[PDB]
Amino acid sequence: MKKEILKVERGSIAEELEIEKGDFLLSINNKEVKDIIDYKFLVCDEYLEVEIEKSNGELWELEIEKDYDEDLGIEFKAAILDVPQRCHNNCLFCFIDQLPKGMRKTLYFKDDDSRLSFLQGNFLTLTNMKDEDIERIINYKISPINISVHTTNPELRVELLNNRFAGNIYERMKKLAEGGIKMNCQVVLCPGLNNAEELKRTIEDLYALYPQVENLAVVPIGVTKFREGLYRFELFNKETANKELDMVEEYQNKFIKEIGKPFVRLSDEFYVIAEREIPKEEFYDGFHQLEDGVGVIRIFRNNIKNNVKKLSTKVKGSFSLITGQSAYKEILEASRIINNYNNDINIEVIKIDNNFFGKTITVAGLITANDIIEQTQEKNLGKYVIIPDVMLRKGYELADISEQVFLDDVTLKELSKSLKREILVCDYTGEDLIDIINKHSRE
Numbered sequence: 001m002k003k004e005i006l007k008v009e010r011g012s013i014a015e016e017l018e019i020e021k022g023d024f025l026l027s028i029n030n031k032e033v034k035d036i037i038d039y040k041f042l043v044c045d046e047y048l049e050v051e052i053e054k055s056n057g058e059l060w061e062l063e064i065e066k067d068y069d070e071d072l073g074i075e076f077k078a079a080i081l082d083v084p085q086r087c088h089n090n091c092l093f094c095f096i097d098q099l100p101k102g103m104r105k106t107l108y109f110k111d112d113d114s115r116l117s118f119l120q121g122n123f124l125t126l127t128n129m130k131d132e133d134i135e136r137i138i139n140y141k142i143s144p145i146n147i148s149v150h151t152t153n154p155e156l157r158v159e160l161l162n163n164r165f166a167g168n169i170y171e172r173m174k175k176l177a178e179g180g181i182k183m184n185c186q187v188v189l190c191p192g193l194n195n196a197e198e199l200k201r202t203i204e205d206l207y208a209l210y211p212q213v214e215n216l217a218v219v220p221i222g223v224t225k226f227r228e229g230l231y232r233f234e235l236f237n238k239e240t241a242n243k244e245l246d247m248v249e250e251y252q253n254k255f256i257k258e259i260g261k262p263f264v265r266l267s268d269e270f271y272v273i274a275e276r277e278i279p280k281e282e283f284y285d286g287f288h289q290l291e292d293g294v295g296v297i298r299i300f301r302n303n304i305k306n307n308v309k310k311l312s313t314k315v316k317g318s319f320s321l322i323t324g325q326s327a328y329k330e331i332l333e334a335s336r337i338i339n340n341y342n343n344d345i346n347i348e349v350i351k352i353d354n355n356f357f358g359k360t361i362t363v364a365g366l367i368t369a370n371d372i373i374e375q376t377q378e379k380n381l382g383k384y385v386i387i388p389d390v391m392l393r394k395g396y397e398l399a400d401i402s403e404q405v406f407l408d409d410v411t412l413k414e415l416s417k418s419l420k421r422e423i424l425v426c427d428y429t430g431e432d433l434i435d436i437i438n439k440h441s442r443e
């Protein structure tokens with residue numbers, strides 16, 4: 001049951017303590033690590049005594065203080081009996097299947113249900129998990145378990161995921177709830193398949209498990225232009241987004257009356273498509289779903305409103321902000337707020353159409369360098385170009401220059417040379433935009 005180490009994350013605890021690829025993980029707090037479920041339980045602790053066998057045979061005993069939810073930074077080889085490295089689905093909407101061919105290999109990995117995704121707490125369909133796995137999760141009180149539900153209608157879920165076990169999800173969630181496990185849930189909403197009365201059923205079934213099921217996020221199906229031969233979806237438009245938002249509002253009103261929270265939320269893209277006003281900050285209850293596209297517009301507006309009073313009024317600067325279709329109106333309004341506060345901050349916002357993936361793709365993080373270059377050829381860029389960090393692969397801050405990459409594998413430095421401008425990377429929530437402008441403007 002010794003576990004060969006395959007990867008050590010830059011900046012991690014394991015790296016600090018000189019754990020390396022090819023070392024072996026032997027035990028944590030005197031317990032063997034049988035698989036990823038044991039591992040997740042054992043690292044939920046502020047103190048770990050870790051036994052490592054080095055590749056050269058040395059035995060190390062490490063004393064490790066850490067935050068309870070802090071990761072060690074190691075990935076290790078799967079056991080013969082373990083959570084799989086891949087999903088067991090063929091979702092009708094699978095985002096991997098609608099990638100164009102020829103991109104970097106890691107983009108095609110069907111790893112959203114993998115052992116490493118489970119460890120990170122991503123949304124899981126659980127179709128590749130055995131009942132014994134669920135029972136061990138309960139016994140270990142591994143919580144929360146975040147679940148891609150889509151529908152609690154068993155036959156409908158089998159049809160959406162193409163896995164013969166996929167109808168088990170509601171019985172499995174009931175088991176988790178009865179075991180005291182907390183769950184956050186997601187639905188990918190496909191008009192004519194799992195919306196309307198089907199989403200009503202899903203909402204009702206999930207709320208029956210409150211407070212173990214803590215909330216439900218509903219996101220719209222998104223497509224690229226590369227769906228030849230794949231299932232043909234109807235997309236939400238302004239009419240049907242407004243209809244779905246109105247339908248779900250009946251449930252949100254019920255839940256606000258009962259428990260003081262909306263429980264189910266539709267993601268920001270629904271409000272953009274519907275041209276509907278973004279809810280106030282209280283609706284988002286601490287903004288814990290930002291990485292799932294829920295509450296990002298409102299927190300962005302909040303961060304600009306809060307921080308613009310910190311913009312120096314004595315400086316001058318020029319900036320070009322790069323964004324996509326869904327965010328353009330919000331970024332434009334932030335630029336107007338900034339320029340109203342100090343009109344010597346010359347800011348233009350440049351919307352990039354997603355010709356690479358197809359213009360049905362609209363969120364800012366899917367903009368490629370190729371499209372930025374092509375669509376700024378006839379622009380007079382400001383001294384600094386600012387992009388949001390969602391346009392780069394995760395880890396860019398600590399990464400080597402060659403590893404700060406857009407989805408088309410152009411690096412941040414290469415794009416800067418192409419644009420003949422220094423490029424600044426800002427937090428996609430807007431938290432540091434004013435600060436970056438202050439630091440790059442002249443008195």
Ligand code: B12
Pocket residue numbers: 095096098099106107108219221222223224267268269272290291292293296297298300301321322323324326327330331357360361362363364365366386387388390391392393394405406407426427428429430433
């Ligand atoms: C929803 C989503 C999708 C949908 C997109 C549908 C659509 N309409 O485009 C789907 C599922 C199709 C999708 C697919 C992919 N996605 Co995706 N997706 C997301 C997600 C979870 C939320 C995006 C969202 O809904 N935003 C809502 C809209 C309204 O806001 P926005 O456009 O994002 O803009 C806001 C902020 O970014 C900010 N902002 C925007 N521009 C600017 C500019 C400046 C200067 C500033 C200050 C702020 C700012 O303010 C806006 C709000 O006011 C993001 C996560 C994230 N943190 O962004 C990942 C994310 C964009 N996806 C990512 C990835 C990797 C992919 C895939 C490549 C995965 C794959 N292996 O195939 C695919 C590619 C396409 C495909 N194969 O279908 C990565 C991209 C990172 C990168 N660039 O390398 C992200 C960032 C998640 C991650 N893992 O880091 N995705």
Ligand SMILES: CN(CC[C@H](N)C(=O)O)C[C@H]1O[C@@H](n2cnc3c(N)ncnc32)[C@H](O)[C@@H]1O
Pocket residue numbers: 093094095096112123148188219220221222223291292
């Ligand atoms: C949004 N992605 C993960 C979240 C993202 N990595 C983040 O920032 O947290 C991918 C997930 O979106 C869902 N998904 C897959 N295909 C589509 C699609 N075509 N449209 C919308 N959601 C999809 C699946 O649950 C998939 O695991």
Ligand code: SF4
Pocket residue numbers: 087088089090091093094095096097109110111112113125
């Ligand atoms: S679970 Fe579905 S969306 Fe995720 S990789 Fe597997 S088939 Fe694609």
